[PDB]
Write a protein that binds this DNA or RNA. Structure first.
Ligand SMILES: [Mg+2]
Ligand SMILES: [Mg+2]
Ligand SMILES: [Mg+2]
Ligand SMILES: [Mg+2]
Ligand SMILES: [Mg+2]
Ligand SMILES: [Mg+2]
Ligand SMILES: [Mg+2]
Ligand SMILES: [Mg+2]
Ligand SMILES: [Mg+2]
Ligand SMILES: [Mg+2]
Ligand SMILES: [Mg+2]
Ligand SMILES: [Mg+2]
Ligand SMILES: [Mg+2]
Ligand SMILES: [Mg+2]
Ligand SMILES: [Mg+2]
Ligand SMILES: [Mg+2]
Ligand SMILES: [Mg+2]
Ligand SMILES: [Zn+2]
Lengths: 185, 49, 143, 47, 66, 143, 49, 260
RNA sequence: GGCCUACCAUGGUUUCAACGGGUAACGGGGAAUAAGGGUUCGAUUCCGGAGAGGGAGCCUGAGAAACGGCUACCACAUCCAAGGAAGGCAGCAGGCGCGCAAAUUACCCAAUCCUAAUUCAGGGAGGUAGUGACAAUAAAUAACGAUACAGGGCCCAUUCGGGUCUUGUAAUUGGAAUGAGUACAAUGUAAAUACCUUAACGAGGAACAAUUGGAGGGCAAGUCUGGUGCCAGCAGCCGCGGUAAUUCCAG
RNA sequence: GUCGACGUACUUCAUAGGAUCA
């Protein structure tokens, strides 16, 4: 007795484990954006499946149906805001485009690397998950934080990192005291 | 085996353990049924007081 | 028309006609009468216990041959005695005589160069511990 | 001490598991190396 | 270095004799900020006796500094 | 060995797609009552642009007047008509030459032989009506 | 089929079975005299040493 | 189940109290009072949840026992007292008077009223009868029983009651053109005028209301409350006036109210 | 009210399936698969019924055919000075049901609510922490360089460039980064614990030691089987020495 | 009783056709 706190799983297994075009595709994706396992890709393909089917099921309405106008403007507004869709391509038709790389480009990891403060993809994932970048002034350490369209100007080095100008951190102080203790005190 | 329960005994306040735990041991080793082994049910043995 | 009625007042005929000619479908009568498991070797169960009655091929010269790997095992529910495979031939040292092997179906998908028609079970746990945990030397057999 | 403390081996209890790389620990690292290796091949056959 | 204590969503509730609000603390270059320092500064801002100010809640924000 | 192809990904195929129809894609569409444009929308979940080649349209017009409803479906105004630089030959040969010369169409067809000959070419997905809908085989952007 | 077993014979008596032997084992300093002391103190209310 | 129940598990509460699940396991169950169970609001859902004066359901009791809150002039202390439609909750400190009226989403609004309006309420009669020793009475919707009414008052007339004396002051008949506030069913809170009325000897006489944008709808008479003539109402209506916007116009309104 | 009694009448249901059996049948909201039509599951967070070992009674009360109420009987079973007496976990914890197994006989009314004469007492209702990887969410287990054989880009191959788009094969090493953990402290909370925050420590085999499976390869002064020779096949943790020694498919 | 008639359960036998080449 309490009310149930609901939940549901965000990814789903595809049709078949092997189908060598699928393995080659997942290797291209998970090597290009610097991912970890297949669940990241399947989670994004689960999101994009849900988006594209609900948009399809809208297209089988007729224009000036209130349900289609309401939820179409809703879906288009959200996908514009995330950045996935463009600003000019704002008809409902264009979301039956939108391959997976569009989502995986708005990911915070790749968005660090593209802003050129990260020197690779994997180095970006490591700066993210070691408490170093800060989207608002909020230190984000999730690599899958789906950056919005107007957060993107505010990504920078976290004010309490050692790169965002606070304090040399752990091994730099240790070496500083070791050098300036062996020479002097 | 798995699920075999162990008991955790805190301090020795007075030369002896607590009462809640020791009372649990006493209850548990006084409900317990033993297994018919092989070597013990062919040979007489004797423990010498 | 076809054999069946079609008028809009004959649902009762169609519904009874499906309710009779449905007992002539082996999976239906199998799953309602509760016959569905004497196909399966064990009873209803998925594993089954057994006593190691003896070993087979303990005097077979040719090593790793299948008849070297098979023991002969009496089940404790029926009383019927069958034969059982064992993975990894070194694991014949673990089973002795009057152990309790817990058998599972062998269920092999395919048949190899020198295999055996007739072994249908395989040994999973020998006297409580599991043969992957003795062969990998995690646990050891509590006598 | 006088205490016969326990081994390492009979604490973590991993007998006879085979020896894998230092790259089955970290899936991201393994897919990274396998991508930048199977991209070399496509830089010879797409010549 | 300098906490700043701002007080948001102020309601004056005179039928339990109080002013209830949401304390919002900035403390940069400092960890979690002590509760007696809050009751001192709050009871000074509102000009009330220190033993008349109560305070609770206070989760400090992921990333740290508020 | 074009600049788009991965090992077998073939990442120059993308929404909106361009399918090539065979002559017995139309027959089994009319038979299983799926519809061309919305059927491809309902499987690929993206816009489609079905294309029909001059060799295939000649073959449809060669069938006769018993198959005139399929011809009615093929002259539909929103099925574009790709024209082909051919003598005018068998349809399946024209499809294979199109596929080799550009590698950016997916091929909707239903004969087994053309299925095999397409499957040799690496990176050409292959729609086909089965059961009740348009199942797609070798496309790595499904769900 | 968790119940079934190799059948074995018991040969413990039914009228007066002997006392069960409860070994208490462990390393040197681990406190295995306080255990026996406090178990007996709970089970007879009569402390030993 | 051998006797009256006494606990009400949250998730069986009335949906319009807006009680969040996962905050506890049970919900305030209203005592017996003037208004029904499913269509009341306890004082603890009003003081704690709505106005945010309390934080617990204990500080509510320490408000109610200081003799602060009064429902309809008379000071009430049972913390789950069933306040209801058309009551006048006076809080002396804060100088406030509220009236509980609906709003077009179905909820109960926080609707402050002035002082001179806070000294009457409306009551739809529910029966008239000869009482005892030949004395007529009316029985309004909040359980009241008023002797000696004006003989032109029949069932469904809205009476206007003076809180202090308790006497009937005024009344309003039930006929077409009368302004109607709907308290019940799917259109809960919409305000229109009456247009027609269907007879149905045997059950459930329907009523065709039309709001002030010409959208007719039909409800049972049971769910209809009369609150004044055309134009002029007698209570003060909440903001938004009972219009029942539609969700595309609601979002155009919200978005065009972009002021900061 | 055939609910029962007295008298009277002979009716009532039924191939549109009554009656009688079977149900590993509490009903519903609901869960799953699904192109659909359907098919299956629903003791199990909400509502409705029924029960408190089995059958039958009943008291007090507005409300009970009540079982943390009573009375007798069937079944179990506890104490005894042998005369008597007291019982009901399908509440919470915890046990037996087998010889083969799996949460704590924990803290509290602080929150949600309930009861009472009542703001205050009480509540194993309900919260809190603990405990087998139930079902779910996020995601660590290293990042960037420079060194040690080859070439691949290829400006160039008229012949030496090792020059370099650097892709690495890498096995040494260069400093930078951080939390798992430990911890002053504050916060959290009824009180703690943990999270969130943070002084001081905390990374080279980063020994601060990822796993589960299946496919191949070789292993001879070895064994065993068969044969139209030196072979083949099975297999190979078993050889000539040697085990504080062999430092081996670095492993 | 290595008994019969059933009822369940399982096993097994029947797979090559054309074209070219030698
Ligand atoms: Mg001792
Ligand atoms: Mg109950
Ligand atoms: Mg009536
Ligand atoms: Mg009679
Ligand atoms: Mg059922
Ligand atoms: Mg049942
Ligand atoms: Mg149920
Ligand atoms: Mg009952
Ligand atoms: Mg029982
Ligand atoms: Mg009473
Ligand atoms: Mg009873
Ligand atoms: Mg009980
Ligand atoms: Mg009870
Ligand atoms: Mg229990
Ligand atoms: Mg209390
Ligand atoms: Mg009194
Ligand atoms: Mg409970
Ligand atoms: Zn052509």
């Amino acid at each position: 007795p309490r009310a149930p706190r609901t939940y549901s799983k965000t990814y789903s297994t595809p049709k078949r484990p092997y189908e060598s075009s699928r393995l080659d595709a997942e290797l291209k994706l998970a090597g290009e954006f610097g991912l970890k396992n297949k669940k990241e890709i399947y989670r994004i393909s689960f999101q994009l499946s849900k988006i594209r089917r609900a948009a399809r099921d809208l297209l089988t309405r007729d224009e000036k149906d209130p349900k289609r106008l309401f939820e179409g403007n809703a879906l288009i507004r959200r996908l514009v805001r995330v950045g996935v869709l463009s600003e000019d391509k704002k008809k409902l038709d264009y979301v039956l485009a939108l391959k997976v790389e569009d989502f995986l480009e708005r990911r915070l990891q790749t968005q660090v690397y593209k802003l050129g403060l990260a020197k690779s993809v994997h180095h970006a994932r490591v700066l993210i998950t070691q408490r170093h970048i800060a989207v608002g002034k909020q230190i984000v350490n999730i690599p899958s934080f789906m950056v919005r369209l107007d957060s993107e100007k505010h990504i920078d080095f976290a004010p309490t990192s050692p790169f965002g100008g606070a304090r040399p951190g752990r091994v730099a102080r240790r070496n500083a005291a070791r050098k300036a203790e062996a020479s002097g005190e | 085996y798995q699920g075999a329960k162990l008991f955790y005994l805190s301090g020795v306040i007075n030369g002896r353990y607590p009462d809640r735990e020791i009372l649990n041991l006493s209850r548990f080793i006084s409900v317990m049924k033993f297994r018919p082994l092989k070597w013990r049910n062919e040979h007489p043995y004797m423990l010498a007081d | 028309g076809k054999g069946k009625p079609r008028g809009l007042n004959s649902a009762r005929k169609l519904r009874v006609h499906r309710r009779n000619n449905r007992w002539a479908e082996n999976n239906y009568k199998k799953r309602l009468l509760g016959t569905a498991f004497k196909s399966s070797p064990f009873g209803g169960s998925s594993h089954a216990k057994g006593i190691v009655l003896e070993k087979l091929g303990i005097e077979s010269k040719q090593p790793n041959s299948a008849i070297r790997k098979c023991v002969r095992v009496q089940l404790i529910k029926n009383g019927k005695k069958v034969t059982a495979f064992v993975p990894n031939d070194g694991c014949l040292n673990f089973v002795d005589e009057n152990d309790e092997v817990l058998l599972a179906g062998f269920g092999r998908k395919g048949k190899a160069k020198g295999d055996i028609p007739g072994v249908r079970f395989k040994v999973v746990k020998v006297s409580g511990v599991s043969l992957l945990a003795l062969w990998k030397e995690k646990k050891e057999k509590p006598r | 001490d006088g205490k016969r403390a326990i081994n390492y081996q009979i604490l973590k209890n991993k007998g006879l598991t085979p020896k894998r790389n230092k790259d089955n620990r970290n899936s991201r690292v393994k897919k990274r190396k396998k991508y930048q290796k199977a991209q070399k091949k496509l830089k010879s056959v797409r010549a | 270095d300098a906490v700043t204590i701002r007080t948001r969503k102020v309601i004056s509730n005179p039928l339990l004799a109080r002013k209830q609000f949401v304390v919002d603390v900035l403390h940069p270059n400092r960890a979690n900020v002590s509760k007696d320092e809050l009751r001192e500064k709050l009871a000074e801002v509102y000009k009330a006796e220190k033993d008349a100010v109560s305070v609770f809640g206070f989760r400090t924000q992921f990333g740290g500094g508020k | 060995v074009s600049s788009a192809l991965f090992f077998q990904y073939n990442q120059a195929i993308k929404p909106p797609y361009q399918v090539l129809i065979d002559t017995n894609f139309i027959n089994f569409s009319i038979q299983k009552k799926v519809d061309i444009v919305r059927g491809m929308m309902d499987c690929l979940l993206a816009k489609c642009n079905p294309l029909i080649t001059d060799c295939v349209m000649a073959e449809l017009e060669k069938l006769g007047p018993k198959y005139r409803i399929a011809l009615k479906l093929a002259r539909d105004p929103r099925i574009k008509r790709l024209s082909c630089s051919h003598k005018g030959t068998y349809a399946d040969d024209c499809l294979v030459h199109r596929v080799l010369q550009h590698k950016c169409y997916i091929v909707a067809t239903n004969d087994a032989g053309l299925k095999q000959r397409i499957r040799k070419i690496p990176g050409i997905p292959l729609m086909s009506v089965g059961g009740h809908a348009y199942v797609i085989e070798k496309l790595p952007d499904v769900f | 089929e968790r119940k079934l077993h190799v059948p074995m014979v018991d040969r413990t008596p039914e009228d007066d079975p002997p006392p069960f032997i409860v070994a208490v084992v462990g390393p040197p300093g681990t406190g295995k005299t306080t255990l026996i002391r406090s178990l007996v103190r709970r089970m007879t209310k009569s402390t030993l040493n | 189940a051998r006797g009256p129940k006494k606990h009400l598990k949250r998730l069986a509460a009335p949906h319009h109290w807006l009680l969040d699940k996962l905050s506890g396991c049970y919900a305030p169950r209203p005592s017996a009072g003037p208004h029904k169970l499913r269509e009341s609001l306890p004082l603890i859902v009003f003081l704690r949840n709505r106005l945010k004066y309390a934080l617990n359901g204990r500080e509510v009791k320490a408000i109610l026992m200081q003799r602060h809150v009064k429902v309809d002039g008379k000071v009430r202390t049972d913390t789950t007292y069933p306040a209801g439609f058309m009551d006048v909750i006076t809080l002396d400190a804060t100088n406030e008077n509220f009236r509980l009226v609906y709003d077009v989403k179905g909820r109960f609004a926080v609707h402050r009223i002035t002082d001179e309006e806070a000294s009457y309420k409306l009551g739809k009669v529910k029966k008239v009868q000869l009482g005892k020793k030949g004395v007529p009475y009316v029985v309004t919707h909040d359980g009241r029983t008023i002797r000696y009414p004006d003989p032109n008052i029949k069932v469904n007339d809205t009476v206007k009651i003076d809180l202090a004396s308790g006497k009937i002051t005024d009344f309003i008949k039930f006929d077409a053109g009368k302004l109607v506030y709907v308290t019940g069913g799917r259109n809960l809170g919409r305000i229109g005028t009456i247009v027609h009325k269907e007879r149905h000897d045997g059950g459930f006489d329907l009523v065709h209301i039309k709001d002030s944008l010409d959208n007719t709808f039909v409800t049972r008479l049971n769910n209809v409350f009369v609150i004044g003539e055309q134009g002029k109402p007698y209570i003060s209506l909440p903001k938004g006036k009972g219009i029942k916007l539609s969700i595309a116009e609601e979002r155009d309104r919200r978005r065009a109210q972009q002021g900061l």
